[model samples]
Target chain A: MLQDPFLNILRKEHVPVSIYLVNGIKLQGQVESFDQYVVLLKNTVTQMVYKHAISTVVPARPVNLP
Target chain B: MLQDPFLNILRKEHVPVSIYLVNGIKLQGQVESFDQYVVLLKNTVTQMVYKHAISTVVPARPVNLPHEHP
Candidate 1:
């Protein structure tokens, strides 16, 4: 789980950065640097956009998962 | 190791924030803004959750991985 790995990083102050997947989908990384993550996210969004950028913008909200 | 560095920003989408610490960590600064990354991640979940702004909360999937090579 995210918590377990995250706690381990805290225990070692390792920042626990990595892009993870919940279901073949790379969500985000766990770096302490928000800029890093933001940049990465922006890039990911852009790449996906070129192939599938939202023709219309909608604020990103996670799908209600069961 | 997290990608040789993210690609550059173009739109000035000024939400570009900052945070970095893989080790006694002072996770602060970089001065980007958002309601929650509105433009920061609810202030330092990458941030250090400072000495002020005492009433914030977050909804993260969370983390852990202590035994990778086991």
Candidate 2:
């Protein structure tokens, strides 16, 4: 998602960034790290488009309940 | 999916991502935090979509309950 309909939504502000992994393959699923987790549903990864539906079901994978 | 219909159910609070790993993955399932959690319907790296899932029965990972391996 170079931009939207992708990118992070902050109610009023739409922040966009060019994200790519070091491996050059791409990340998938509804996943985010400790600090970035709250932005769920507000963001999307552009590279996710090239993967399989079975593989591309989520944007930022979430960590489970502790 | 690039299409909306295939996007499935994304509630206003929808949580999903399009990234995974065979071994390079950082974390799997609900490692949300030691702080707290709101999505009990959530699980980890795998889904509820498999056999003998009687024990791995977590939300979004639906399977045949009481299923046992022979």
Candidate 3:
């Protein structure tokens, strides 16, 4: 059985990230913890997000330049 | 940690489903198998989908609950 590799990255390291939700909401924070139902993120205030509703996930910075 | 209850539903039962991709494409098929990278569907044809690009997943139902596969 295969698993979600993206989640393991969130757990191993709390990196700055942005998430896009199906509800058209955007969140920017460090990943706190996550499960099937929700993903908790915190920078100043913590937000519990619905994982199923998420449309996209991206890093805060673009990996550019050589 | 609680796992994805939705996926379990798909895995256990190969129900007809509609999946929305972030690219604005929609797929309707029977959920075959899925992992982090992809979801394989079997119906008319088999299509390997990227999970990260998925925007939504819903049943292709109608009002008054007609039928999923029309």
Candidate 4:
């Protein structure tokens, strides 16, 4: 899927990420899992963030996508 | 199915919408169609917006959810 490629890479690498919401909130975590509508982010506690609320997921290190 | 509920209603009703992107850009259009990864919004032209780039979809009017009963 269009969005999953980036997420999958992050999840597989256990990469730390900062997710910025459209409302200007920033959340830091690791990608636990994701589907069409939501992404599960894990830090201390796991949070399910709806995709509509998300703007960007920035990995701590740059990711190379194939 | 979580996001589709809102989009389906807008598409069926031909409701005008304001879609806010995470980058603070707002796009005004009618819902043409959508899938898991993208929404096709129609104005003078149809634009395909990737779901990852979207933040919110605000309808011009209030919508009643089929599952919500008063």
Candidate 5:
């Protein structure tokens, strides 16, 4: 029932999100937490991307909605 | 009073905010609008940073109130 699609997508399990930093570093990771400043993400690689430091967040895999 | 300091700061006038983009572009813009998907901003330049594309939004000037620091 979440209105925000971004938050809604994040709530799903094993969903990979592509986080693009202001510096243009894109990392695909699972959303561990989307707290205020720091968003904790980890995959094969990772970082504690400050919310302000990020340029974009994208869903990595294709949606399987019926 | 705005509960969200981020929104509160955006409510300010001529407050330069540094918005970091996913493409590695940092832009300084005034908060014209902070709607659901896009945030409208302008200064020397203007942009409507989509919520998904923006990495972060920051205030340009130092926050005076420590307790109110974001």
Candidate 6:
């Protein structure tokens, strides 16, 4: 399985993220889990975001890629 | 390396695609190459699109997944 390095860092660090979808929807949450095709984002609720629908994942703080 | 199944099929089949960005820009091209973080889209020229900036990739024709065998 191919793990996304950037997403893994954010997940491991529990960073809050702002996810922007291609359809112009913006979602705020932390990454609970992610795979090649989808991400489980957790805030007050959990949301499953398909990778194809994602435009960007912005961390609240600057992230250093490993 | 984690090769995306969807992208791989598109690239291998030379599928024309419409890629939509988060900022509402639309690009027409074929997949030249891609990695976990970026995609190289080839039209008249090659454009490198960051995965973070991409919203959707629509192929000209429907694709059957590798595991979708009857």
Clashing pairs in 3: none
For residues B4-67, write the lDDT of model 1, one tens digit per residue. 1111121122223333222122233332222211112323333222212222221122222234
Candidate 1: where are CA atoms >4 Å away?
A1-16, A31-66, B1-70
Once fitted onto the true fold, the runs of candidate 4 whose alpha carbons sit more than 4 angstroms away are B1-70
Chain A vs native chain A, TM-score per candidate: 0.21, 0.22, 0.72, 0.93, 0.68, 0.91
Ranking by lDDT: 4, 6, 3, 5, 2, 1
**Root-mean-square deviation of Cα positions for candidate 6 versus the true structure, in angstroms:** 9.6
In candidate 3 chain A, where is summed lDDT lowest over 10 consecutive residues?
A: A57-66
Pairwise lDDT winner, candidates 3 and 5: 3
Judged by DockQ cut-offs, is candidate 3 incorrect, acceptable, medium or high? incorrect
Residues A1-66, model 2: lDDT tens digits: 111212223112332222223233433333232122222322554223321111112323332212
Residue A24's lDDT within candidate 4 is 71
Backbone clash pairs for candidate 5 read A22-B24, A52-B56, A54-B55, A55-B21, A55-B22, A55-B53, A55-B54, A55-B55
Error of 2 at A6 (Å): 8.7
DockQ of each: 0.02, 0.09, 0.08, 0.12, 0.12, 0.11
How high is each candidate's TM-score?
0.16, 0.20, 0.45, 0.52, 0.44, 0.53
Clashing pairs in 4: none
Provide a comma-separated list of chain B TM-scores, one per candidate.
0.20, 0.16, 0.70, 0.90, 0.67, 0.88
Better of 1 and 4 by TM-score: 4
Q: Candidate 4 on A1-66: residue-level lDDT in tens?
A: 346666788899998887767677878999999997889999889999987877655567766553
State which docking tier applies to candidate 2.
incorrect
